[PDB]
Amino acid sequence: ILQTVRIPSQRQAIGIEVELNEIESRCEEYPLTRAFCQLISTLVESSFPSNLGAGLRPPGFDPYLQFLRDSVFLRFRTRAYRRAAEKWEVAEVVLEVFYKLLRDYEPQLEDFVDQFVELQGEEIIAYKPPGFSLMYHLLNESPMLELALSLLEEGVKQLDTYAPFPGKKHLEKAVQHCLALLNLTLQKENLFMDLLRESQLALIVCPLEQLLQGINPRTKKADN
Amino acid sequence: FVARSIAADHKDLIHDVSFDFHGRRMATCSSDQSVKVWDKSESGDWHCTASWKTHSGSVWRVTWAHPEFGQVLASCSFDRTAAVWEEIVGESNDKLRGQSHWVKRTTLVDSRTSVTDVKFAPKHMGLMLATCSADGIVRIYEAPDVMNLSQWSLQHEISCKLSCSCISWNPSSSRAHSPMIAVGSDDSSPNAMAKVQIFEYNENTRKYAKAETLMTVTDPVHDIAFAPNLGRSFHILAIATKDVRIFTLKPVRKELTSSGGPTKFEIHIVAQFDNHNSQVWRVSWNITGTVLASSGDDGCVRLWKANYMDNWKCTGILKGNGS
Amino acid sequence: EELDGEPTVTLIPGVNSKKNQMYFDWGPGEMLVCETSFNKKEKSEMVPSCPFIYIIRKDVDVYSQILRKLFNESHGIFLGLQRIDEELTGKSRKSQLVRVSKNYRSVIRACMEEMHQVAIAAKDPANGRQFSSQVSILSAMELIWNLCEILFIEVAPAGPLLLHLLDWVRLHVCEVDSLSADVLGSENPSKHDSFWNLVTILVLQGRLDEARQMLSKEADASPASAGICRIMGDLMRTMPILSPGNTQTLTELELKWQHWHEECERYLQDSTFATSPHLESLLKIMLGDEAALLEQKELLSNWYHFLVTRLLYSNPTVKPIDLHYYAQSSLDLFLGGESSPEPLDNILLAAFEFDIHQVIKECSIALSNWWFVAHLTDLLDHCKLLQSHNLYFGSNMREFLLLEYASGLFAHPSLWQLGVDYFDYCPELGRVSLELHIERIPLNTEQKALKVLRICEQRQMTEQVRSICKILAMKAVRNNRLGSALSWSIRAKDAAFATLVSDRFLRDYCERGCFSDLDLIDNLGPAMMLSDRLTFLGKYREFHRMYGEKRFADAASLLLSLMTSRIAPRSFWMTLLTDALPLLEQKQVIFSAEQTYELMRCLEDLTSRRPVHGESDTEQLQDDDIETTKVEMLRLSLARNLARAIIREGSLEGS
Amino acid sequence: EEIYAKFVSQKISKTRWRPLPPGSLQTAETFATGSWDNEENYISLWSIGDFGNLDSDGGFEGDHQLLCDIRHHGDVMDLQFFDQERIVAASSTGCVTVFLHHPNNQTLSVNQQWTTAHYHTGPGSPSYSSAPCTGVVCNNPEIVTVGEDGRINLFRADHKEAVRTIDNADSSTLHAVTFLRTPEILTVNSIGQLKIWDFRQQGNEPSQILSLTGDRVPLHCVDRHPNQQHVVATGGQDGMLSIWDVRQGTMPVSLLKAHEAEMWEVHFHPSNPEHLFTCSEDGSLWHWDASISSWLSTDPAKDRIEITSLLPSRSLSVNTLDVLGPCLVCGTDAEAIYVTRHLFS
C-alpha cells in the first residue's frame, strides 16, 4: 500500500505514493495521506519488527521514512490546499511520527556497523534505525533541517501578529514537534558523536549547536 | 590543388560540365547523344545516378535551374533543339526498362540552326530560360507554372545579326539595374567589326533593347561570363577569344531629360591576357566573382585574380602531366 | 607590387596537356575539370580510354584534421579580439593585445606538439614526413609570430629588445636543451665529444650561468685548466646584462659593459687563454669578434641567431631604428654572396626593416593558408598600424584577407558557421559575400536548414529566407510531404506556393474522399489568409468542422460562399450541390429564395456546358444514368426549397 | 567545480552515458558521441580523464581518452545505448544502425542495420527518396524511430524486419519520440503538437493529441519524468520549455522561457528528477533545481525553480547533453565536448 519493493522494469509507482501525487494533489485536500501518517503514528508506539521487509528487501524502516520525508514532508510546502488549515494538519501528523521515532530510539554501537544480509544470492547492507536516519538528517545542512528551521521562523512570523488564522492550533503543534525533535537531537547528540568516534565509520555530521548558527537562506542572518 | 578523379564513360567527346547550386550534383553531355548526372555521397565519393539519351545531335551544353524551382536541367543540340528535364521520385517504370527518372517535360524547336548555348535566368525574374543559335538570334522562354514544365511561352526573339556562340545573364539581384544579357559570336568574317553585343530589358518598351556593343572585340568568341556582384556600382564581364579579356561596365547615370531610351556604360578593358599562346574555350567565375578560370589549346586551366590595386594577374596554372 | 613570380603550377595525373583542351565549372570548395580526348582505336589491341572528370579542391590546408583545432581555438580568440573596447587605455589595451597575441601563439604551439607526437606515432615514414612538414610550417609561423609580437605588439624598447630577442631565439632554437641532456646524462660530461660545442652554443645563446655550470665539469675533471676555466666563468658573471626589476639607465649598462669589454680584452693581451684554444675562442666570441663568430658558423644553425649573438657581444644598447642595418649585415655575412636568402629570411628581414606590408606580402606567398595572415593583420588593425586604407573595391586590406579566409571556411562542410562570424566583421563587402554563399549550404535535414534560416533571419537576409523556405517547400512537394510543404511556403510568405500546396490537398481529398492531414488545416490560424485557395482549404475543412461538430445555417451560407467564390474547382461543383441536398429538403427553410437561385445558377453553368457530340464508346453510359439522377434530384430539391422559401419570405412582406 | 572542455575536430550532434551495472557504486566512467556536418561522420567511445594524479615525469594524462570509433553514413541525428555493450543510432540517410562495443579488443562494429527504416515515396514505383531519421528510443528488446517521412517504426534487437510501421503519422516532420508505457509512445512535430500512439490499437491513428493554442511552435525535443509516466517536458523552436500532464486536457500545465533559440534537448535527472537540464541554438546550457512535483506548479512566482548556466560563456550551438549521477557531458558545433565528474560542488 506503500510500494517498498520498486521493480527495475516498472515505470510508474503503485499505492499511496501515486494517490497522493495524482489524486490528493488534484483535489487540494489530503485525507488519505493524513490517515496513512496517523496509521504509522500508532504503529511506532506499538513498535515495528526489526526484520520488517526481510527476503523481499533489506530489513528495517527507512523505506517508510523515505515516503514520509521525501514524498510527504519535503513536498508539504509545494502542494496547494483547498483547506488553508490542511497545510498545517499535514505537518502535525508527520512531525508526530518523526518525534516518536527519535523519542524512543537510543543510539547503540551496532547502528555504526554495516550489518550484511543475504538477498536472493547477493550480500546487501540492512536499513539503519529510523532514529539513526533522523539523527543523520538533523546533524547535517539537510533539506529536512531547512524545512524544520524555516518552520520555526514561519511559526514566530505568524504568532508575532497575535491574530487568529485557519488551522492555527495545528501550526502551534507542528512548531512544538519541530522544537521537541531538535531538543531530542541535543539530548542524544554527544552519545551519537562518540559512538561514531569509536566505530570509525566514514560519515560526516556537525553539532546541532552549530548548524542552528547556519545562515538562514530566507533572512540571511544566523537567526535560527 | 588536391585532385580526385572519375572515369566518365561517355562514348564520344564530352562538350560541357556543370555543377548544381549546392555542389552536391554535376551534369555532363556528349557527342554520343547522352547526358549524365553524378551525385556526391555522405562519404565524399561521387556516383553516376542517371545516364540517358537527351537529343538526336551532339549536345553543346548542360545547365541547372536554381533549387527554389526544384531539380530541373536543360540541354542544347546540333539537331536545332533544346530540351527541359525534371527529376521525379517514384515515376520510374519497369514497363519501359532502362529509361531515366530524369523525364523530358518539353522540347523547344524554334531555332533554324544548331542551338549553341542555353542558360537559366536569375531566379527573381521567374522560371525563365535563354537559348542561342547560329541563325544569329537569342530566344527567351518563360514557364507560367513551376510544376507544368511541359508549357513554356517564347517571350523574346533577340537579333544579334551575327551567329551566336555563347550567352551570359547579368547576376544582379539589385533592383537598380534592369535585366541584362550579353552575347558572343563565332563569326569568322572580317566585315563584323565587333563579336560581343549586350542587351537590356527596358520597361518603357518591354523588349530587350541593344544597349552596347564591344567595338574592341574584333575576334571570334567561344564563351562569355558576367562576374557575381559583391554590391559593385559597376559590372565585370569575362570573354574567351584569341586571348582572355576582362571588361568593366559602369552605368552612366541618366539626366532627368533622357527618358524612354536604354542605359549606357562607361566601359573599360581592365585586363587582356595572351598567355594561353592559343584560343580560349571557357570562362567561369568563382561564387563571389573575385577569381576567373579559363582553358585553352595549351592544356592548362589558368586562374586569374585582382591584387589589392585591382591589377588583374594570373595566380595559378592547373595542367595535366601525362603520367 | 604583388604577384611578380610564376603563377602556382598544379599538376593533374593522367591528363595529357601536351595537346588536349579542357572544360571546367565552380562549386563551393571544388572546381571540376574534364579533358576533350576520346581514343577511337586505330587497330591496336589496347583498351580505349574513356574521358575522365577531375575534382580539384582548393589547396589551402583546411582539411588537415589537426588544423581544425587551430581554426576553432583561433575563432574563440578572434571573437575575444572583436569584443575588446577601443577606449581601453594604451597600457591596459596594449597588455590585453599582447595577451591575445600570446593566446594565438599558444594554439600554434599546442597544435604543433600534438602533430609532432602524431609524426612519431606515424606507422608509415611517408605519413610521418607529411606531419613533420606541417610541424615545420607551424614552427615557422610561431617563429615569425614571436618576432612580430616583440616588434609590433609588445614593441620592445632599446635594452629590453635584446632580452626579448635572446628568448625569441631560445623558444625556437631548442636544439641546445636536447644536446644538454645527452652531455649531462653521460658518465663523464666533460668527455662527451659535443661538450665543447654545447659550452660554445650556450654562450652563443647568452645562457652564461648554464655555460658556467658546463665549464664546472671541466674544472672538476681537469685540475690543470680549472683555474683558467674559473677566470672564464667569472668573466661570464661580470657581464652587464639588463635586469627587468632593476632601476638603472641604458648609459649605466653601456658604461659598465664598456669596462667589462676593456677587462675581457685585457686578458687576451696578456694571452691568458692561449693554453686552451676553446677558451681563447670563447673570449673572442664574448668580445664580439666577427671573425671568431663566423669560425663558429657550424654552431650557429641560422643567420638570425648570429644577428642576436652579434648584438649581445657588439651592441647591447641597440634600438629598433638601428636594427635593419645589423639584420642585413648579418644576412650578408652568413650567406657570403654565393647563396640566395630563403622565403623565411625575406620575411624575417622585412620584420627587422619594420615593413609590416612586405611581411604581410611574403607571408601570403610562403604560407599556404590565409589563416596566419588574416589573424595577424586583424591584430595589427587592433594596434592601428595598417592598410586600414581603402582598396580600389572599397574594402580595406584586413577585410580583403578575412573575405578569402571566410570563403575558405565555407569551402569545408563543418566550418561555414565560423565563416559567418568571419563575414560579420567585414563592413563594405562582408554581408554581400555571405549572401552569395549562404543559400548553397547542403540542406540534408530540416534541422540543418533551421540553423541556416536562423542565421539569415538574425541578419535580415529576407529574400534568402524566402529562397531557403521555398527550397524546403520544394523538397517537401517532390517528396509529397504536404504539411512541411505548407508550413515552409507559409515561412517563405509566397502566396503562389501556398495556393499550389492547397492545389495538392484539394486533389488529394478528391483522390481519397479525405485529406492526408486535418490538424494542419484546423491549426492554420492567421496563416490561413496567405491566399484565397488556402482560405478555401481552411473553410471547406471548417464546413467539415460543422458536420460532425455543429449546425446548419452557418454551414449552408458557408457552402454557398465556397461555391460562388472563384475558388471552388468545377470538377467538385456537383459534390457541393450534393452537399446542399441534406440542407434543402429540411422542414426549416435554411437557404432563402434569393440563395436558392444562386445554387441553381451554379447548376446551370455546370450543365449548359456539356457538348452535343456523338457515339463512341459503350462503357460511358453508366455514370450518365447517375449524373442525370444527380441533376433531377437537384432540380426537384431546389424547386421545393424555392417554393417553401417564397411562401415564407412573401408572408414576412404581409403582416 | 570547473568543467573540462575538449576539442575533437568534429561537430558533436549527440552525447550519451554508458549505462551503469544495477547495484554498482561507480560514477559514470564512459560516454559515447555521434558527429555531424563533416566530409566523414563517426560514432566514438570515450573515457573521462583522471585529474587526480601526476607521476614522476610530469605528464598530464587527464585527457578524455578515445577508446574506439566507427565511421557512420549520413549525419548522426540521434543516439542511445541499448544495453551495456550495444548502441543504436539514426541517420540523415533514413538508416537506423545497432552497434556493438568489443571491450576485449577496443573496437566498435555493426550489430544489425535497417538501411531503409525512413524514406519518402512517389507515384507508383519503389524508387524511394531518402528521409532523415530524426529520433530513436529503446525498450530492450524493442526500439522506436521517427523522421521527415512522418513514419513511426517499431523494431526489435532479435528481428530483421519492422515489427510495425505507421506511414504518415503526420504530413510534416516528426522530431523526437519517448515511451510513456511499454506499448504506448508520444511523438513531437513541425506543428507544435504532442501525438500519443498505442501499438495495441489496430488503426494507425493517434490515441490522443495535445498542442499549444493555435500559433505554431515546432517541438524539437521531449522527455518523460522517471517516477511519473504522465509528466512530460518538451522544447520549442523559440526557446520555451513546456511541462505537460498528459491526463489533464490538451495543453501544458507549466510554461517557462529557457533560451533565446531552438532548444535541442531536455532531460530530467535519472535519479534526482526534481532537477532538469537543457541545451540550444542560443549557445547556452542550463541546470534547473526545484527541491505536487514542482514542475507541475501553475505559479513559478510562489513555488521555486532556481536556475544556473553551466557554461561560463556562450559558444557555437550546444546540440546535446547527458547526466548520470554526479557526471554531466554536452556536445557542440564548436567541434568540441564539455565534461564534468561533479555537478554538486
UniProtKB/Swiss-Prot annotation, chain A:
Illness: Nephrotic syndrome 13: A form of nephrotic syndrome, a renal disease clinically characterized by severe proteinuria, resulting in complications such as hypoalbuminemia, hyperlipidemia and edema. Kidney biopsies show non-specific histologic changes such as focal segmental glomerulosclerosis and diffuse mesangial proliferation. Some affected individuals have an inherited steroid-resistant form and progress to end-stage renal failure.
Gene expressing this chain: NUP205
Family in the record: Belongs to the NUP186/NUP192/NUP205 family.
Assembly and oligomerization: Part of the nuclear pore complex (NPC). Forms a complex with NUP35, NUP93, NUP155 and lamin B. Does not interact with TPR. Interacts with TMEM209 and MYC.
Locations listed in the record: Nucleus membrane; Nucleus, Nuclear pore complex
Protein name according to UniProt: Nuclear pore complex protein Nup205
Job of this protein: Plays a role in the nuclear pore complex (NPC) assembly and/or maintenance. May anchor NUP62 and other nucleoporins, but not NUP153 and TPR, to the NPC. In association with TMEM209, may be involved in nuclear transport of various nuclear proteins in addition to MYC.
Superkingdom of this protein's organism: Eukaryota
Expressing tissues: Expressed in the testis.
UniProtKB/Swiss-Prot annotation, chain B:
Keywords, comma-separated and alphabetical: Cell cycle, Cell division, Centromere, Chromosome, Chromosome partition, Isopeptide bond, Kinetochore, Lysosome, Membrane, Mitosis, mRNA transport, Nuclear pore complex, Nucleus, Phosphoprotein, Protein transport, Repeat, Translocation, Transport, Ubl conjugation, WD repeat
GO annotations of cellular component type: cytosol; GATOR2 complex; kinetochore; lysosomal membrane; nuclear envelope; nuclear pore; nuclear pore outer ring; Seh1-associated complex
Record-linked SUPFAM superfamilies: WD40 repeat-like
Molecular-function GO term, any one: structural molecule activity
Gene3D superfamilies: YVTN repeat-like/Quinoprotein amine dehydrogenase
Entry keyword Nucleus: yes
Subcellular location: Chromosome, Centromere, Kinetochore; Nucleus, Nuclear pore complex; Lysosome membrane
PANTHER family: NUCLEAR PORE COMPLEX PROTEIN SEC13 / SEH1 FAMILY MEMBER, NUCLEOPORIN SEH1
Family membership: Belongs to the WD repeat SEC13 family.
Protein name: Nucleoporin SEH1
Species the sequence originates in: Homo sapiens
Gene name as annotated: SEH1L
Swiss-Prot record, chain C:
Keyword terms of this UniProt record: Acetylation, Centromere, Chromosome, Cytoplasm, Cytoskeleton, Disease variant, Kinetochore, Membrane, mRNA transport, Nuclear pore complex, Nucleus, Phosphoprotein, Protein transport, Translocation, Transport
GO cellular component, one term: cytosol
GO biological process: lamellipodium assembly; macrophage chemotaxis; mRNA export from nucleus; nephron development; nucleocytoplasmic transport; positive regulation of DNA-templated transcription; protein import into nucleus
Modified residue annotations for Phosphoserine: S222
Tagged with keyword Iron: no
UniProt modified residues of type N6-acetyllysine: K91
This protein's record includes keyword Phosphoprotein: yes
MF term (GO), any: structural constituent of nuclear pore
Known outcome of mutating A580P: In NPHS17; decreased function in nephrogenesis; unable to fully rescue morpholino-induced nephrogenesis defects in Xenopus; decreased interaction with NUP160
Main location: nucleus
Compartments where found: Nucleus, Nuclear pore complex; Chromosome, Centromere, Kinetochore; Cytoplasm, Cytoskeleton, Spindle; Cytoplasm
Pfam families from the UniProt entry: Nucleopor_Nup85 (PF07575)
Subunit structure and binding partners: Component of the nuclear pore complex (NPC). Component of the NPC Nup107-160 subcomplex, consisting of at least NUP107, NUP98/Nup96, NUP160, NUP133, NUP85, NUP37, NUP43 and SEC13. Interacts with NUP160, NUP133 and SEC13. Interacts with NUP37, NUP107 and NUP43. Interacts with CCR2.
Similarity remark: Belongs to the nucleoporin Nup85 family.
Protein name, per record: Nuclear pore complex protein Nup85
Species for this entry: Homo sapiens
Swiss-Prot record, chain D:
GO BP annotations listed: cell division; chromosome segregation; mRNA transport; nucleocytoplasmic transport; protein transport
Organism of origin: Homo sapiens (Human)
SMART domains: WD40
Principal localisation: nucleus
Gene3D superfamilies (UniProt xref): YVTN repeat-like/Quinoprotein amine dehydrogenase
Repeat positions for WD: 7-56, 71-109, 126-165, 169-207, 214-254, 258-291
Lineage per the UniProt record: Eukaryota, Metazoa, Chordata, Craniata, Vertebrata
A GO CC term attached to the entry: nuclear pore outer ring
Tagged with keyword Repeat: yes
One Pfam family from the record: WD40
Keyword Protein transport (UniProt): yes
Name of the molecule in the record: Nucleoporin Nup43
Subunit annotation: Component of the Nup107-160 subcomplex of the nuclear pore complex (NPC). The Nup107-160 subcomplex includes NUP160, NUP133, NUP107, NUP98, NUP85, NUP43, NUP37, SEH1 and SEC13.
Keywords: Acetylation, Cell cycle, Cell division, Centromere, Chromosome, Chromosome partition, Kinetochore, Mitosis, mRNA transport, Nuclear pore complex, Nucleus, Protein transport, Repeat, Translocation, Transport, WD repeat
Compartment(s) of residence: Chromosome, Centromere, Kinetochore; Nucleus, Nuclear pore complex
Function (record text): Component of the Nup107-160 subcomplex of the nuclear pore complex (NPC). The Nup107-160 subcomplex is required for the assembly of a functional NPC. The Nup107-160 subcomplex is also required for normal kinetochore microtubule attachment, mitotic progression and chromosome segregation.
